[PDB]
UniProtKB/Swiss-Prot annotation, chain B:
Name of the protein in question: Small ribosomal subunit protein uS19
GO biological process: ribosomal small subunit assembly; translation
Purpose of the protein: Protein S19 forms a complex with S13 that binds strongly to the 16S ribosomal RNA.
Family membership: Belongs to the universal ribosomal protein uS19 family.
From Swiss-Prot, chain C:
Gene from which this protein is expressed: rpsM
Pfam families cross-referenced by the UniProt entry: Ribosomal_S13
Protein name: Small ribosomal subunit protein uS13
Region entry Disordered, spans: 90-114
Tree of life domain: Bacteria
Keywords: Ribonucleoprotein, Ribosomal protein, RNA-binding, rRNA-binding, tRNA-binding
Swiss-Prot record, chain E:
Family: Belongs to the universal ribosomal protein uS7 family.
Assembly notes: Part of the 30S ribosomal subunit. Contacts proteins S9 and S11.
Keywords: Ribonucleoprotein, Ribosomal protein, RNA-binding, rRNA-binding, tRNA-binding
GO biological process: ribosomal small subunit assembly; translation
Record-level GO cellular component terms: cytosolic small ribosomal subunit; ribosome
UniProt GO MF annotations: mRNA binding; rRNA binding; structural constituent of ribosome; tRNA binding
Gene3D superfamilies tied to this protein: Ribosomal protein S7 domain
Species of the source: Pseudomonas aeruginosa (strain ATCC 15692 / DSM 22644 / CIP 104116 / JCM 14847 / LMG 12228 / 1C / PRS 101 / PAO1)
HAMAP family in alphabetical order: Ribosomal_uS7_B (MF_00480_B)
Function noted in UniProt: One of the primary rRNA binding proteins, it binds directly to 16S rRNA where it nucleates assembly of the head domain of the 30S subunit. Is located at the subunit interface close to the decoding center, probably blocks exit of the E-site tRNA.
Superkingdom to which the source organism belongs: Bacteria
SUPFAM superfamilies from the UniProt entry: Ribosomal protein S7
UniProt protein name: Small ribosomal subunit protein uS7
Swiss-Prot record, chain F:
Superkingdom, taxonomy of origin: Bacteria
Organism annotation: Pseudomonas aeruginosa (strain ATCC 15692 / DSM 22644 / CIP 104116 / JCM 14847 / LMG 12228 / 1C / PRS 101 / PAO1)
Self-association and partners: Part of the 30S ribosomal subunit. Contacts proteins S3 and S10.
Biological function: Binds 16S rRNA, required for the assembly of 30S particles and may also be responsible for determining the conformation of the 16S rRNA at the A site.
GO process terms (BP): translation
Annotated NCBIfam families: PRK08881.1
Taxonomic placement: Bacteria, Pseudomonadati, Pseudomonadota, Gammaproteobacteria, Pseudomonadales
InterPro entries: Ribosomal_uS14, Ribosomal_uS14_bac/plastid, Ribosomal_uS14_CS
Protein name, as recorded: Small ribosomal subunit protein uS14
Gene Ontology MF terms in the entry: rRNA binding; structural constituent of ribosome
SUPFAM superfamilies tied to this protein: Glucocorticoid receptor-like (DNA-binding domain)
Protein family membership: Belongs to the universal ribosomal protein uS14 family.
Length: 127, 83, 114, 99, 152, 100
RNA sequence: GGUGGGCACUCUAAGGAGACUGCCGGUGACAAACCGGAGGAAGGUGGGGAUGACGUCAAGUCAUCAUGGCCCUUACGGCCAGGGCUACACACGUGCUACAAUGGUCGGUACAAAGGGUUGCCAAGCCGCGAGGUGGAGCUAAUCCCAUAAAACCGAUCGUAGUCCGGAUCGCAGUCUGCAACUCGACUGCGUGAAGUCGGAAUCGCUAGUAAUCGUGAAUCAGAAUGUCACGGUGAAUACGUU
């Protein structure tokens, strides 16, 4: 059975497998809270699952590579959205209204010559 | 500073001109250019004229300069004063 | 109470003030001579101030340390070596910038002529 | 069980060489997996262009190195040992291992 | 901008309370991207408010912002030879921004053990108006009547 | 980039390369913990025997066409203001302009 | 994933599809176009880069190079030892660190990207508080090494004091490369501990992964980066308007 999804965000790539269950939630074979330490990451992961009142309807097994905690949380959200829509293909409109399937295309801007940061410049005294 | 793996450092011709010197007591300053060489307590009392850039300044060695190099007792920049 | 020690402070911090002890050797004295670092020196018993006095008198402090640094400084000066002259004028001795930014060894700006 | 490693500067030559060697190996009776591509090394250089003082005027150049891997299952015909002059022509370097 | 094509992004990521103003206050108190630090500081402040204040802390929060928001704002315009000031009604969206900024910048200047209980102190003071933020609000308000002559 | 100066760095290259072995042996014996102070000291004397113009520190690499002491790229052999000239003509293999 | 094994997935790298105001509504001189909507990962040149017209400033470079003239030829040409370019009553530009409690310490703790390495990286082990030393493994490298990210989170402590802040300066003792660390190197150990209480006239950078803040890598190079170039972590506020 089961379904699959992939979520990418902020150089973070996550794979999600969805099976029947009640939402044990395993992050690289680890407890959800043992991974997400004192942050909203748990809630942002649970956002799309709870938007469709299916928190206890499924069990989730995921893995994550690359990026920071916020990027991995966003990747989990996107991946579980793409996995859930693969099961109940009538809620695509609901997620489109919620704007969860849409990927975040923002990415770090490269540094350029003559500048300190990607856009910061020196002070420019005129005399 | 130089590691403990190497105790002294002396110009070899300086070593030969000091070791041969001690056969007789202090009678003439010894002319030297290598400011880098260490000085041990075995040329104490000898007067060494160390090169400074335009002249050989003579300095009389004592026992209380074993741990300081030849160049420390010769100044190369004058700075007589702004006014 | 040592030599003009403060109170209401942890043992190591209080010990640090005696000019010859910092964070490391204060911790060593605190651990060796059995005392609680958490316990404030105010509530420490008289059984420990004598031990701390022994530890303080063991190494160095105050007058001897001032005298030996001053002896070293005059030792450098009287010979006439480069470092001695550098410390004589008050200019930096390690060899930092003197064209500018050598302020802590010159004082205020002291503008020209007047 | 031999493995062939290909180094190149531009992918245009390396793709042609890999296709040629794969076709020859499959035609001669050998068994060959799928050409494996490796991450391409990118060497970055930045150089002043003015002959005198202009620090903000740079030029950035890049050297790309492409890596390919192949394997031969059931080695039956060593005809590839008579074709190096043809398999590698101008800018492709070929290494053969585990003969 | 002369073009006026710059649209605005919408942020709503309340972790547990599920409100709107709370997140914007989070951003206001957030410094150098320390979002979790802001989380814990503001939540400790709100816990102190909840233990001190009998009712829920969110309506106390909105009441406090109700007493800090300035109704009108004065803004200097130069007539071409004299430096005047002109009172204008504040944009409805701008009221919340001024409220949040003033409350944060005034909670920053107490001087007690931390700014969590500072934020609590000015949150309760602004709940009826004995703080310093309300002092600046009423001063700016009274400057309008002080300059009602021009208005137009 | 006077040609006498290029000559006197090339001669430095030969002088450095022509020993290439006494330096290694002497320094290895010096750095060997179990060699006795006598073999420390004679090795120091031996190192001080040979001319100073033998070490790699005295060797300042230079452009192979102009000899500019500054602006060097050791992946190539050219200077700052000849690498670009050769690259724009396509002489350097696999060199292009980068954007990413 | 350690093993047998698989071609599911991530990923790596080649070739393609896709975004073209394409469809619907209104405005519009029934034109160009504008304002909305649906779908879609992406919507209005999607984001960033490379790309710099005719010419101006007798703009910069004769010292990278080449070249018309002029100049010296026992010297303005060559070689070698030391010294200086790191000097110091002052002034200015560009930066780093702070003046603290959204902090400083202590314990264990989770997640990056990019890159360099066979005249090289240099592991395990052992000896040192320590910078390091012996040792010799693996690697021509998605295979071995550099290499443990940090800010973040939890608990304990300090209680706003020029201080469990801040580190300049200085004294003593050391490690390492180098023929050689005085002039004139980088780090390490103990101790000393300054100015600094957020900065006048004036002035600067920035519109979304932006500012701010946190760490990592490469070039030059025996050694020497708060500089240059490059990569990711967290991550805002504001724009009514053109006098
Ligand atoms: Mg990038
Ligand atoms: Mg950045
Ligand atoms: Mg200025
Ligand atoms: Mg010439
Ligand atoms: Mg060199
Ligand atoms: Mg649209
Ligand atoms: Mg001109
Ligand atoms: Mg010379
Ligand atoms: Mg200079
Ligand atoms: Mg401190």
């Amino acid at each position: 059975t089961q379904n699959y999804g992939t979520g990418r965000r902020k150089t973070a790539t996550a794979r999600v497998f969805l099976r029947p269950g009640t939402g044990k939630i395993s992050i690289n074979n680890r407890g959800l809270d043992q991974f997400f330490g004192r942050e909203t990451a748990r809630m942002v992961v649970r956002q799309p699952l709870e938007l469709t009142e299916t928190v206890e309807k499924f069990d989730i097994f995921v893995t994550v590579v690359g990026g920071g905690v916020s990027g991995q949380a966003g990747a989990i959200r996107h991946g579980i959205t793409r996995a859930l829509i693969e099961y109940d293909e009538t809620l695509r409109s609901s997620l489109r209204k919620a704007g969860y399937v849409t990927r975040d295309a923002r990415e770090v801007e490269r540094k350029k010559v003559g500048l300190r940061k990607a856009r910061k410049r020196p002070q420019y005294s005129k005399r | 500073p130089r590691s403990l793996k190497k105790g002294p450092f002396i110009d070899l011709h300086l070593l030969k001109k000091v070791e041969v010197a001690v056969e007789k007591n202090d009678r003439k300053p010894i002319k030297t250019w290598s400011r880098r060489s260490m000085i041990l307590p075995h040329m104490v009392g000898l007067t060494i004229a160390v090169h400074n850039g335009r002249q050989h300044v003579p300095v009389l060695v004592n026992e209380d300069m074993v741990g300081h190099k030849l160049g420390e007792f010769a100044a190369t920049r004058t700075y007589r004063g702004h006014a | 109470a040592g030599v003009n020690i403060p109170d209401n402070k942890h043992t190591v911090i209080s010990l640090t003030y005696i000019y010859g002890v910092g964070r490391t050797t204060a911790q060593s004295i605190c651990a060796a001579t059995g005392v609680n670092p958490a316990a404030k020196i105010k509530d420490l018993s008289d059984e420990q101030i004598d031990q701390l006095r022994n530890e303080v008198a063991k190494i160095t402090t105050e007058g001897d340390l001032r005298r030996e640094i001053n002896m070293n400084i005059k030792r450098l000066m009287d010979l006439g070596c480069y470092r001695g002259l550098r410390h004589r004028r008050g200019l930096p001795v390690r060899g930092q910038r003197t064209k500018t930014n050598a302020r802590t060894r010159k004082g205020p700006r002291k503008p020209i002529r007047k | 069980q031999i493995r062939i490693r290909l180094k190149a500067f531009d992918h245009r030559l390396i793709d042609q060489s890999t296709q040629e060697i794969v076709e020859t190996a499959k035609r001669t009776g050998a068994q060959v997996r799928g050409p494996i591509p490796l991450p391409t090394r990118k060497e970055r250089f930045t150089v002043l262009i003015s002959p005198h003082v202009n620090k903000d005027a740079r030029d950035q150049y890049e050297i790309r190195t492409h890596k390919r891997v192949l394997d031969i299952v059931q080695p039956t015909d060593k005809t590839v040992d008579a074709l190096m002059k043809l398999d590698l022509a101008a800018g492709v370097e070929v290494q053969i291992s585990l003969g | 901008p002369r073009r006026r094509v710059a649209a605005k992004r919408e942020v709503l990521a309340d972790p547990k309370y599920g409100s709107q103003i709370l997140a914007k206050f989070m951003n206001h108190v957030m410094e150098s991207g320390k979002k979790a630090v802001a989380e814990r500081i503001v939540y400790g402040a709100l816990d102190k408010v909840k233990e001190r204040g009998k009712a829920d802390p969110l309506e106390t929060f909105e009441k406090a912002l109700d007493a800090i928001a300035p109704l009108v704002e004065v803004k200097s315009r130069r007539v071409g030879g004299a430096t005047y000031q002109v009172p204008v009604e504040v944009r409805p969206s701008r009221r919340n921004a001024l409220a949040m900024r003033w409350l944060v910048d005034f909670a920053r200047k107490r001087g007690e053990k931390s700014m969590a209980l500072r934020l609590a102190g000015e949150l309760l003071d602004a709940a009826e108006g004995k703080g310093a933020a309300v002092k600046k609000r009423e001063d700016v308000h009274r400057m309008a009547e002080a300059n009602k002559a021009f208005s137009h | 980039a006077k040609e006498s100066m290029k000559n006197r760095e090339l001669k430095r290259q030969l002088t450095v390369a022509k020993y290439a072995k006494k330096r290694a042996e002497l320094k290895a014996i010096i750095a060997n913990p179990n060699s006795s102070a006598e073999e420390r000291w004679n090795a120091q004397v031996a190192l001080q025997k040979q001319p100073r113009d033998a070490s790699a520190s005295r060797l300042r690499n230079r452009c192979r066409l102009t000899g500019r002491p500054h602006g060097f790229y050791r992946k190539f052999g050219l200077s700052r203001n000849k690498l670009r000239e050769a690259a724009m003509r396509g002489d350097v293999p696999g060199l292009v302009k980068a954007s990413w």
